[PDB]
Short mmCIF file of C-alpha atoms in Angstrom, two decimals:
data_model
loop_
_atom_site.label_atom_id
_atom_site.label_comp_id
_atom_site.label_asym_id
_atom_site.label_seq_id
_atom_site.Cartn_x
_atom_site.Cartn_y
_atom_site.Cartn_z
CA UNK I 89 19.36 14.92 -7.14
CA UNK I 90 18.75 18.55 -6.17
CA UNK I 91 18.03 20.94 -9.03
CA UNK I 92 18.33 24.25 -7.17
CA UNK I 93 21.77 25.03 -8.65
CA UNK I 94 20.44 24.81 -12.23
CA UNK I 95 18.04 27.77 -12.10
CA UNK I 96 20.25 30.82 -12.78
CA UNK I 97 22.51 31.69 -15.70
CA UNK I 98 26.22 32.13 -15.04
CA UNK I 99 29.09 33.85 -16.84
CA UNK I 100 32.54 32.28 -16.42
CA UNK I 101 35.68 33.09 -18.40
CA UNK I 102 38.16 30.78 -20.09
CA UNK I 103 40.69 28.96 -17.92
CA UNK I 104 44.28 30.20 -18.01
CA UNK I 105 47.54 28.63 -16.88
CA UNK I 106 48.09 27.46 -13.32
CA UNK I 107 51.62 26.43 -12.37
CA UNK I 108 53.33 25.06 -9.26
CA UNK I 109 54.88 27.43 -6.73
CA UNK I 110 58.58 26.46 -6.47
CA UNK I 111 58.57 26.95 -2.68
CA UNK I 112 55.50 25.09 -1.37
CA UNK I 113 54.07 23.51 -4.52
CA UNK I 114 50.90 25.60 -4.37
CA UNK I 115 48.89 26.49 -7.48
CA UNK I 116 49.98 29.91 -8.73
CA UNK I 117 48.12 32.00 -11.28
CA UNK I 118 48.56 35.18 -13.31
CA UNK I 119 44.89 35.41 -14.35
CA UNK I 120 42.94 38.05 -12.37
CA UNK I 121 39.58 36.70 -13.64
CA UNK I 122 40.13 33.04 -12.72
CA UNK I 123 37.59 33.21 -9.86
CA UNK I 124 35.02 35.52 -11.51
CA UNK I 125 31.51 34.06 -11.71
CA UNK I 126 28.48 36.29 -12.34
CA UNK I 127 24.84 35.31 -11.84
CA UNK I 128 22.02 36.44 -14.14
CA UNK I 129 18.27 35.86 -14.08
CA UNK I 130 18.01 35.43 -17.86
CA UNK I 131 20.19 34.70 -20.87
CA UNK I 132 19.44 38.12 -22.37
CA UNK I 133 20.61 39.78 -19.16
CA UNK I 134 23.89 37.87 -19.40
CA UNK I 135 24.41 38.67 -23.09
CA UNK I 136 23.68 42.35 -22.43
CA UNK I 137 26.33 42.50 -19.70
CA UNK I 138 28.93 40.74 -21.86
CA UNK I 139 28.44 43.06 -24.85
CA UNK I 140 28.43 46.11 -22.58
CA UNK I 141 31.91 45.23 -21.25
CA UNK I 142 33.27 44.26 -24.67
CA UNK I 143 33.89 40.59 -23.92
CA UNK I 144 33.44 37.88 -26.52
CA UNK I 145 30.87 35.34 -25.38
CA UNK I 146 29.59 31.87 -26.22
CA UNK I 147 26.03 31.05 -25.16
CA UNK I 148 24.93 27.53 -24.20
CA UNK I 149 21.17 27.06 -24.42
CA UNK I 150 19.51 25.72 -21.29
CA UNK I 151 19.11 21.94 -21.02
CA UNK I 152 15.86 20.96 -19.29
CA UNK I 153 15.05 17.32 -18.44
CA UNK I 154 12.25 16.11 -20.66
CA UNK I 155 8.96 14.99 -19.07
CA UNK I 156 8.79 11.23 -18.58
CA UNK I 157 5.89 8.80 -18.21
CA UNK I 158 6.39 6.95 -14.91
CA UNK I 159 3.92 4.20 -13.98
CA UNK I 160 4.39 2.00 -10.93
CA UNK I 161 1.95 -0.53 -12.39
CA UNK I 162 4.26 -1.23 -15.32
CA UNK I 163 6.64 -2.91 -12.86
CA UNK I 164 4.20 -5.86 -12.94
CA UNK I 165 3.21 -6.32 -16.58
CA UNK I 166 1.41 -9.30 -18.08
CA UNK I 167 3.15 -9.30 -21.48
CA UNK I 168 5.75 -6.50 -21.50
CA UNK I 169 9.48 -6.35 -20.81
CA UNK I 170 8.94 -3.66 -18.15
CA UNK I 171 8.14 -6.36 -15.57
CA UNK I 172 10.87 -6.22 -12.93
CA UNK I 173 12.54 -9.41 -11.72
CA UNK I 174 13.23 -7.90 -8.28
CA UNK I 175 11.77 -5.27 -5.97
CA UNK E 65 -22.74 -45.63 10.06
CA UNK E 66 -24.70 -44.55 13.16
CA UNK E 67 -23.97 -40.97 14.18
CA UNK E 68 -20.63 -41.11 16.02
CA UNK E 69 -18.97 -37.94 17.32
CA UNK E 70 -16.21 -39.37 19.53
CA UNK E 71 -13.44 -40.39 17.10
CA UNK E 72 -10.94 -38.37 15.07
CA UNK E 73 -11.52 -39.12 11.38
CA UNK E 74 -8.52 -37.06 10.19
CA UNK E 75 -5.87 -39.75 10.55
CA UNK E 76 -4.74 -40.01 6.91
CA UNK E 77 -1.96 -37.46 7.47
CA UNK E 78 -0.16 -39.66 10.01
CA UNK E 79 1.63 -41.38 7.09
CA UNK E 80 2.28 -38.62 4.56
CA UNK E 81 5.77 -38.89 3.08
CA UNK E 82 8.10 -36.09 2.00
CA UNK E 83 6.89 -36.15 -1.63
CA UNK E 84 3.17 -36.47 -0.88
CA UNK E 85 2.29 -32.91 -1.92
CA UNK E 86 4.34 -33.00 -5.13
CA UNK E 87 2.98 -36.46 -6.00
CA UNK E 88 -0.58 -35.16 -5.72
CA UNK E 89 0.34 -32.08 -7.75
CA UNK E 90 1.68 -34.42 -10.43
CA UNK E 91 -1.59 -36.38 -10.51
CA UNK E 92 -3.54 -33.13 -10.94
CA UNK E 93 -1.94 -32.43 -14.32
CA UNK E 94 -4.20 -34.28 -16.78
CA UNK E 95 -7.28 -32.51 -15.36
CA UNK E 96 -5.82 -29.00 -15.60
CA UNK E 97 -7.04 -26.85 -18.45
CA UNK E 98 -4.41 -25.32 -20.77
CA UNK E 99 -2.70 -22.28 -19.32
CA UNK E 100 -2.95 -18.80 -20.85
CA UNK E 101 -0.03 -17.48 -22.87
CA UNK E 102 1.75 -14.19 -22.24
CA UNK E 103 2.98 -14.15 -25.85
CA UNK E 104 6.69 -14.32 -24.98
CA UNK E 105 8.95 -16.96 -23.46
CA UNK E 106 9.68 -14.62 -20.54
CA UNK E 107 9.86 -10.90 -19.64
CA UNK E 108 13.56 -11.01 -20.57
CA UNK E 109 12.64 -12.14 -24.11
#
């Protein structure tokens, strides 16, 4: 339920091939940027860094939970379907 | 009839059967006034 990991913008690159090491079966890679994650305070800061380094970027707009009306008294309603059968 | 305070007058419950309460509740059904209506058959309706 914590929301502390959804407060900063991040910049991750596309995933490249990982194969199986013939000796031990480990996960091998040839992508130097497979573990590169950058943190930005704002979307415009992230876009500025991407364009400065020449990378092509796709921006996903932030998704914020919408405010919700929560009433504990609706659990016991005279004529509504919000009455709960168990507590 | 004279004031007597030396006998237990609550002896009717010595012979109450298992259905006594429900039998009385069944007799108190023609006196009850009509119940209010929620508007639906149940909360799940």
